[PDB]
Each structure stands twice: as structure tokens, then as C-alpha cells.
From a paper:
F17 and F18 fimbriae are wire-like structures expressed on the surface of enterotoxigenic and septicemic Escherichia coli (ETEC) strains that secrete toxins causing diarrhea in infantile livestock. F17, F18 and type-1 fimbriae are assembled by the chaperone/usher biogenesis pathway and comprise a few thousand copies of a major pilin (F17A, FedA and FimA respectively), several minor pilin proteins and a single two-domain adhesin (TDA) at the tip (F17G, FedF and FimH, respectively). The N-terminal domain of TDAs is a lectin domain, also called receptor-binding domain, because it mediates adherence of fimbriated bacteria to glycoconjugate receptors on host epithelial linings. Amino acid sequence and crystal structure analyses of the lectin domains of F17G, FedF and FimH elucidate a previously unacknowledged basis for strain-dependent glycan binding profiles of E. coli fimbrial adhesins, one that is driven by electrostatic interactions.
Surface Plasmon Resonance (SPR) interaction studies using a newly synthesized GlcNAcβ1-xGal series (x being 2, 3, 4 or 6) and F17G crystal structures in complex with these disaccharides provide insight in the structural basis of the variant-specific binding profiles. In each of these complexes, a terminal, non-reducing GlcNAc occupies the primary binding pocket in the same orientation as observed in the initial F17aG structure with GlcNAc. Near the non-reducing end of the disaccharide, Arg93 (purple) is bridging the GlcNAc residue and the sulfate ion S4, whereas variable residue Asn90 (cyan) of F17bG, substituted for Lys90 in F17aG, is bridging the O4 hydroxyl of the reducing galactose and the sulfate ion S4. The mutation in F17bG of Asn90 to Lys90 in F17aG could be at the basis of this observation, because a sulfate ion, S4, binds Asn90 in F17bG. The sulfate ion S4 is situated near the hydroxyl group at position 4 of galactose, where the disaccharide could be extended, towards the reducing end, into a larger oligosaccharide sequence. Variable residue Tyr114/Thr is located near the reducing end of the glycan and faces sulfate ion S1. The S2 sulfate ion binding site coincides exactly with a second GlcNAc binding site identified before in the crystal structure of F17cG, also called GafD. The F17G lectin domain sequences have been aligned elsewhere, however residue 110 of F17bG has been confirmed in the crystal structure to be a cysteine, not serine, that forms a disulfide bridge with Cys53. Interestingly, the addition of 10 mM GlcNAc-6-sulfate to crystals of F17bG instantly dissolves them.
Residue numbers in the entry: 1 to 175
Write the structure that this text describes.
Amino acid sequence: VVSFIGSTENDVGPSQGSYSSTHAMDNLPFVYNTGYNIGYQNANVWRIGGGFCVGLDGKVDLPVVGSLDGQSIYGLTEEVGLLIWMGDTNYSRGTAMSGNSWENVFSGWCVGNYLSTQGLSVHVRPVILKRNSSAQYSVQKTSIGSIRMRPYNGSSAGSVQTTVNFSLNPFTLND
Ligand SMILES: CO[C@@H]1O[C@H](CO)[C@H](O)[C@H](O[C@@H]2O[C@H](CO)[C@@H](O)[C@H](O)[C@H]2NC(C)=O)[C@H]1O
Ligand code: NI
Ligand code: NI
């Protein structure tokens, strides 16, 4: 059995985040290592119980502009892109996103005969695609994509809301 307990619209990263690097940025594309700082995380999005089995599918709506080590680079602007992970509650469980179709980002699990929750996480890392007369790049709030729950092994959603969305909070790149 399943119930929805989280938020439909979700913001990724702190509002007006500031990100900077000492690294050279002469070998483009360059990826800021923002760790898990630019992310959303919530352990309690659906409440599940009684043998219910569920996983997660993810979908990124941004345009693919390249790839880096087996995952897509998504374009925000002509000079700024994103590496995106989606998956289970833990950021370390994040699945490297590629393409614009629904992809399994959490194989799943089943609750025993007790009550628990299904959570999720999303985090991105900024990528410098091309140089710019600024050195300070500014990105506005942008829609990213969605995550839906994936009931499996007989379990069903019914009319319970399955899908939640994500928006990138505006930030600034420095140095
Ligand atoms: C230890 O108690 C419960 O055990 C189950 C099964 O291992 C699971 O760990 C529970 O945590 C949930 O795990 C889900 C998948 O890993 C995750 O989506 C949920 O966010 C977790 N819910 C939590 C931590 O409250 C855990 O309750
Ligand atoms: Ni290095
Ligand atoms: Ni829905």
C-alpha cells in the first residue's frame, strides 16, 4: 500500500548559490566539483507498507549538448551546462542521467509487513562549455525534469500521485 507525502514542485540547490574554483579552466569543458551541494533530498516522498515494492524512474528535459564519461551534458546556456544524477534518498545512490527519456534511477526494494517510506535525491554539477567575457556566469531558475515512483512485483499506484518535479535554483559561477 502507498500514499504520497512530499512536495510536487521541488527546488534544487540553495537560492542564489555561489560557486567558485581555483582550477585552471583551460581544458574545456570544465566541471565544477560542487559535490552534493547543488541538490534536493527527501527521505519521505511516498509512504509505503505491506509488501509494497517500488523503485524510481527519472527524466531530464534539458537538451543534451554532449557527454562526459558515460553521461550526458545538459545545456543551460551557451556557456553553462550540467551533469545530473537522480536516484534513491542518499546522494551516493544517485544514477548518472543520460538522454531525455524515463530511465530507471533506483532498481527498487520492497517493504516487509511494516510501514516505511520511499525517498529520492537529485544533484547536479555545473560545467563550463565555453569561455565568456565575464568569468562570472549567472544562471536563472530553470526546470530540470521529474522523478516518478515505479511500483513493481504486482504492487500498484492506483490513483496515488506518482511524479514530482524539480527546478534548478538560481546561482552564480565564479573564477
Ligand atoms: C531500517 O529501517 C528501514 O529499513 C528499510 C529497508 O532497508 C529502509 O532502510 C528504510 O529506509 C528507507 O529506505 C528507502 C530505500 O532505501 C528510502 O527510499 C527511504 O528514504 C528510507 N526511509 C527512511 C530512511 O526513513 C528503513 O526505514
Ligand atoms: Ni584536477
Ligand atoms: Ni501523477
